[model samples]
Target chain A: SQALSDDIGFLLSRVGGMVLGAVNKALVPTGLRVRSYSVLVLACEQAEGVNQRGVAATMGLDPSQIVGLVDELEERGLVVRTLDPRNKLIAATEEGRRLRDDAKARVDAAHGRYFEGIPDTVVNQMRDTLQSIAFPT
Target chain B: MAESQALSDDIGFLLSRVGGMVLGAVNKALVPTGLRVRSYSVLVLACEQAEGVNQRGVAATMGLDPSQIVGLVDELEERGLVVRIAATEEGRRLRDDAKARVDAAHGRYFEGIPDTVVNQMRDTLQSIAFP
Candidate 1:
């Protein structure tokens, strides 16, 4: 159909927005939003504590925004900020790690529910294409 | 490995992050035109529906709120890029003057992407639907 909904950009934004909304809703019980969940994931997953600048660049958000997310996360006892000589680093606490693990399960279940009928091959192909577009050479 | 792989494997996360990058680039490219991606989307629809489209049409097609469409249409009309034809319908055809600018903005927005990839991406995105 020659409709705006068929336009690639609009479709991408709509799907992305829907996925984000679903994910945020799924994360509600854990008291995390996508942004904070992402930051927490990094904190729990990274070998070294992640710094604000690194989080900003990785997440495509402003450093200031990352700072605020980190602060909120820290306040909730989900993450801790360590003052290094050069920069402050963020790391997940034990509780944070546990929450991340639980939240990860919830988020995955939500994704499965949302993308129930789509074949893995199709989803993978779309993800690959998005990665290419996201980091074009 | 497992922990780091989680976010990367999440399709929802990938879509939002990648989509954000694409939108950020488009918004930056549209700076001179004083139009953000959302407003530009409204304009594109209006241009295509020359007979005039209602705010509800824009909302449904654009996957946005009627309220949000109202603001976007208002901005476009205020800038003389579109106009209301009926009480509820707005008649819009891409202005001869505005077409060139919009095309140039699109060019800048899609700068380095190959046509092959673009075509594939479009097809894939078009096939997607929320369940």
Candidate 2:
């Protein structure tokens, strides 16, 4: 078959879409989508809370888009935004941390099932390759 | 700290970010051809399907909506790059000249990327793209 799958660009897009769709579906019960989950994860983990600009840079999203995701997380009480002297920072609330812990468990389980037959070595190589492509510097 | 770094390390997140970067580069490269990635995709498929294909077939293969496929086809047809054959009723195929142009554009789109990396990505993606 002359598969579009043979094209690297198309393969990247299709695989990316499939992985995203599965992850989003797995996240539904937690009241968080991928974007919000990402924001919460950053907020909970950063020693200093991440600002909208920082999320935008790390996630390759626009600052405006990050604002919306942060807003959704904030409204859900999963994260809170505070004003520093210089910038607005996002931090996960205590409840948000707990939810993130639970969500992480679910997400890891989901990833395990989704990638069942794929070996860790192959997965690691893929991740490294993608990272290099995504951030050449 | 551990939990925060997890999302950044997630393979799904890496896949999406890398996909976005590649798409952005392709879109920029395609500007001179006057076809964005989606239209370019349609043109490539039309060229490949010598027997012709329908909008639904394009949609199914590309994972796009049939309505989105229609708009892309409309643009290509308007440019005389593709034609819908009445013999097949709903089938669309690329014009001869359009094939040459699309092939050239495809080459230009991947000009700087190393074939080694491209082949590696193709292999890795093929494993996960199907199921």
Candidate 3:
């Protein structure tokens, strides 16, 4: 019983600690704060009809939180707020598109640096595994 | 058009859509008070279990970069919410029993939220597939 308990404990400890450190390091650069970067990424990927509500729903961010991040991006001229002809919701500006692309490139480069020693096969395997686990049906 | 090119395009589109959706939800839940979920999760996890976890160990588990975690720990320690218990070079591994206590106490903080919403969200996320 003691050995089993120790093994489980060790595994949990190891896994949990490793995940935290890995995520934080991967998100450090891009000049966009972590949350801001997250917002931009989500908006680019999702945001159908580009409504604020749609962005909120896709991102799982509280409406209030989304507002602040959007505000920041707009202030930096990275994103513009446009009214939807049909719905009057805010849409990202052309600048937002440019910023998002640049940010994504930087983020991808960072990922490359962080995983420099990892093999492509292993990276693909891990990404697939995570994808399966995350989106399993 | 080449099949491989099509597949790559599809995969790229899928990653953007799914990852954006998933992270947006997470960010929304996290951004209310200015804390990123992963970062908060790190502190909370460290508090509940590990005594003193180094940036490297935390990174491996969470699939994050270690360089970033160092600053996170440094910030937390500066705030006095957590501290480096061991003064040695390996002190990063020292346990913060106090943080562990706080983590346990904070476990109930999410009690007001409904489990049904969380489960539904997870289910929705799982329904997505690769192109």
Clashes of each: 0, 0, 29
Candidate 1, B80: how far from true, in Å? 4.7
Q: Write the per-residue lDDT of candidate 1 for residues A71-131, one digit (tens) a residue.
A: 8988989888887778878988988899999988888877776566766666677666666
Q: What is the TM-score (0 to 1) of candidate 3?
A: 0.41
Docking class of 3: incorrect
Model 3 ranges with Cα > 4 A deviation: A1-30, A45-49, A85-90, A132-137, B1-131
- Write the residue-wise lDDT of candidate 2 on A1-137 in tens digits: 24355756677788888877877888989998878888888898775577777787778887778888988888888788888878889988889988888878777776676577876676676666676665566
List, residue by residue over B1-131, the lDDT tens digit for candidate 2.
12335665777787788777767766766666677778877776765656565677778778889899888878877777767621122223333333345345445544566767657767767876665
Candidates in order, interface RMSD in Å:
3.1, 3.4, 12.5
CAPRI quality level assigned to candidate 2 from its DockQ score: acceptable
Native-referenced DockQ of model 1: 0.44
Error of model 1, residue B65, in angstroms: 3.3
lDDT of each: 0.70, 0.71, 0.46
**DockQ for each candidate?**
0.44, 0.44, 0.05
Q: Following a full C-alpha superposition, what root-mean-square deviation does model 3 have from the true structure?
A: 11.8
C-alpha TM-score for every candidate: 0.79, 0.80, 0.41
Better of 1 and 2 by TM-score: 2
